[PDB]
Amino acid sequence: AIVKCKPTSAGRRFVVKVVNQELHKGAPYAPLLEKKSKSGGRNNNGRITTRHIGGGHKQHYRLVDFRRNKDGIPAIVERVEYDPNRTAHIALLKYADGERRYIIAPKGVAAGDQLISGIGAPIKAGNSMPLRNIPVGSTVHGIELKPGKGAQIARSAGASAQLVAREGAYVTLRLRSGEMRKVLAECRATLGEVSNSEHSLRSLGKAGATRWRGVRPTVRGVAMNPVDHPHGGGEGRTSAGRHPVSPWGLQTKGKKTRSNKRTDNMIVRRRK
């Protein structure tokens, strides 16, 4: 489902698109939609605070059910949809009581599949259960950190985590970052991989496609004047002239920035 475009024009050369024909061709589920107005990555104060954000497409937010807390009641997937809010696909579960919900679609999940969450959920790659009921060695996604807070960890397209160890009240997961982390065994997770794993194979072909996604251009620091950037200045084209730093002076080649002593006990082994 990776399609390379023919070079019928400049800007179409090097366009590689993910075209999923199994996605829903109609409208999303209206009761689960919600207004989502854009910021230009701008603050409470009206200040930017996050550069390169602006001018994408209008998007409805989809109310994705991250706390799959309808334990016991089975569901039918019955649809997989496109979500503009995330790189993963979403599936519209229809529960046995008729309630409809949106969840992150797992890898092999198609319309008509049966998903269930709870303690006694069968071990198949769409189901959700607390991490203590997940056998060691399973591949999981959408892992809670706080019981009841909802899925937080493995959520983007193709994301997954590996359950490597299980102590008393904690479970050790291997994140796709390579970090070994401790998670409460009471926290819920969904078995399997997240869908749309081929999303990384796509290539935008042109400057416009990045603008379609709401990303404004990045200007290099060496292209500026010294008043704007630490890398600015120089007659002719020059390098940074100093150890590379952010526009606010923080070194950006190495120079670890993690300063969270509160959560340090949850990190077994650290990788990024």
Partner: protein, 136 residues
């Protein structure tokens, strides 16, 4: 912080001794819950005016503790909740809902010190090694 005790504590409890403790031991544990009281040069004066009527009560509550701890030391009360395995159930096998299980066959047995990190604790010198069996 000089305080005098009301109940006896495990390490330094003489029930009325002049005990010097860290300010955080009181003000956060003893005074709020009630296990001691600051010596204000008159609380010690009023402690003797109440010690005679309180230590007899302290024994009486202690006496009822062993009586209740030994009366219900032979129960094999079993829950009727749905379970998946003997130790791995669909619910939670912990000291969160067993109050009605033991209350239906004797004393209410309010759960405040039923330790399970089934030795139920009820006083400093009184403790019972109750054994719970669950069918699954």
């Amino acid at each position: 912080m000089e305080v005098i005790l009301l109940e006896k504590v495990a390490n330094l409890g003489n029930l009325g001794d002049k005990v010097n403790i860290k300010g955080g031991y009181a003000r956060n544990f003893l005074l709020p819950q009630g296990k001691a009281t600051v010596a204000t040069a008159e609380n010690v004066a009023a402690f003797e005016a109440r010690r005679a009527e309180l230590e007899k009560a302290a024994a009486e509550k202690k006496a009822a503790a062993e009586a209740r701890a030994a009366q219900l030391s032979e129960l094999v009360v079993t829950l009727g909740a749905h379970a998946g395995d003997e130790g791995k159930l669909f619910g939670s096998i912990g000291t969160r809902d067993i109050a009605e299980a033991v209350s239906a066959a004797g004393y209410p047995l309010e759960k405040a010190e039923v330790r399970l990190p089934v030795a139920v604790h009820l006083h400093t010198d009184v403790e019972t090694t109750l054994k719970l069996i669950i069918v699954a």
